[PDB]
Design a protein around this ligand. Structure first.
Ligand code: LBV
Ligand code: LBV
Lengths: 304, 298
């Protein structure tokens, strides 16, 4: 059990469905980039170092980024000017270790946002009058399946020894069930659980991805590798990826359930084939999770 | 008496929309609002017993029909009139062995973003009064009503304005107490199971229901769940004296009890679409949850 020792927070690489920049808070000069940016901008990664990021954004997007930093914000629409035309992205901004990390994801694509809001609203209301826990958990899982389209959503609860059990499940036809199944504690080891307590949402749209390294993997203010703890594109442990290969599910997304600053459980979402869920859909899942979290407590207290 | 007026059976609607009562079976018209004569250019009596599909486009009729199969509202409906098609938001309710169908004007992206951020600001509300202000201001940003108020009831069913957000030179009602007779018992009860209401123009002339009869069970048509229900003259009177010509309120229900109301007032007449009202209700619903989270900061 070297399981718990792998330093998952500093992998020096990202999942390539998105792009990452470290930029300075002053004039927003680039201090590191993911190597896959070469395909975006058609230039060697090294050559972007210390270049103002605004050179590759539209004026409106430059303005919008600058306002976001120097003054609720995520995601921010950013348009990148590339040699092969202007490309539109969801910009995901954060500050950690004296630096600013910008990540560029694909945008939200729904033709059905009003329906989306309605479903989230009726789910929150239902969750709030759930009379027992498996009912509350199942309302959560089924709404999450509604808005993600993933094949199988599970609510996984931790025992005192950090093993866990699937206590609720909603899945599409054909898909095998893991309901009531028990899993060993080493499947979600100690450093992962610590990270998931402070960073409650993660997605792996394609478990077969080729990691794209950071160039360079150095924090410009503090030295050392770039801490990707709070980054949405952080490359994930190869050992977990291999676990998922054996599971037969090639997209994964999970949301933490956190009670008393402690991991109570996870909403785990699997898909057979690779699949992306937009930032805004992930924020909706997190909302659902947070209401579920409150109701877990209401139910626990009602017994005692 | 305030609490004795049967506000749920006025036998008339607000004329910014149209009401049809139809049968559960083959959707033949059992009653219409009198103003449907302006839409279809026939009298109500000529409409009675005609399948409502007769006045809908083929696709509109197909959607209406599947809605009554089995999360449905609003249904887009295009109606066939002498003067061409008109598109509508169809709001369908099913009760008392009849179907009520109401047509409203349809909607109209910055919009979708602004609901998302409102909710994200509520998710990180520091305290209960701040959460209420946020809901007030975000409701005001998306509705465009001149003044929004979070109004909380007391033990004795009287209440006060605990939060507010308003435009330049609209009067403030912050911290003002009002008596329980202002929202009387039969109202509070309705508003506990029917959470949103809008009056786009205080001074509307009601359009009567023709005929005002439930065809399966007898009696006045129960409009409890109707979005176009005509409201109490006594309340209209009061809004006229307040000097405000549009209102819209959303209920806050905690523990199967009315906890409070979000009240939105405009100086002039002002409709907003089913979709924005639904957005505001989402906001009310997130605020509701948060009231419990922030209250338990104790
Ligand atoms: C003897 C009876 C009445 C009386 C009756 C009455 N009121 C209402 C509906 C009300 N009243 C409301 C009151 C307020 N709006 C505010 O902004 C504030 C305070 C800041 C108050 C106290 C509200 C919000 C409603 C709901 C509709 C809306 O949002 O405007 C009704 C029922 C109307 C209906 O048909 O549903 C009735 C019968 N009002 C009196 O003043 C008098 C004592
Ligand atoms: C010796 C190390 C091992 C190991 C490490 C490992 N696992 C994770 C992350 C996750 N593991 C999860 C397990 C489950 N998913 C399920 O659906 C179920 C049961 C139904 C289980 C038990 C989950 C959910 C995660 C979170 C990611 C996701 O949602 O898929 C990590 C951390 C990965 C990272 O963030 O970098 C690590 C290091 N897993 C093992 O099985 C042993 C070999």
């Amino acid at each position: 059990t070297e399981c718990d020792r792998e330093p998952i927070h500093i992998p020096g690489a990202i999942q390539p469905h998105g792009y990452l920049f470290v930029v300075s808070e002053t004039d927003l000069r680039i201090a590191s980039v993911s190597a896959n940016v070469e395909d975006l901008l058609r230039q060697p990664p090294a050559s972007l170092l210390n270049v103002p990021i605004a050179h590759y954004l539209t004026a409106a997007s430059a303005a919008r980024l600058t306002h976001a930093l120097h003054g609720a914000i995520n995601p921010i629409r950013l348009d990148v000017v590339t040699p092969d035309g202007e490309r539109a992205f969801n910009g995901i901004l954060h500050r950690h270790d004296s630096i600013v990390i910008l990540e560029l994801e694909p945008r939200d694509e729904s033709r059905y946002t009003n329906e989306f809001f309605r479903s989230v609203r009726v789910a929150i209301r239902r969750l709030q009058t759930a009379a027992d826990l498996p009912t509350a958990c199942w309302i959560a899982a089924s709404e999450v399946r509604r808005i993600t389209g993933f094949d199988r959503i599970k609510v996984y609860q931790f025992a005192a020894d950090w093993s866990g059990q699937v206590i609720a499940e909603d899945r599409d036809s054909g898909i095998p069930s893991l309901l009531d199944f028990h899993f060993p504690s080493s499947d979600i080891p100690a450093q992962s659980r610590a990270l998931y307590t402070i960073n409650p949402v993660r997605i792996i749209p394609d478990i077969g991805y080729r990691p794209s390294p950071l160039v360079p993997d150095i924090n410009p203010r503090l030295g050392g590798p770039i801490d990707l703890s709070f980054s949405v594109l952080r490359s994930v442990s190869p050992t977990h990826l291999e676990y998922m290969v054996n599971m037969g599910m090639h997209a994964a997304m999970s949301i933490s359930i956190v009670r008393d600053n402690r991991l109570w459980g996870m909403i785990s979402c699997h898909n057979l084939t690779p699949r992306f869920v937009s930032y805004e859909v992930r924020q909706a899942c997190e909302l659902i999770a947070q209401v579920l979290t409150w109701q877990i407590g209401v139910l626990e207290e009602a017994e005692i």
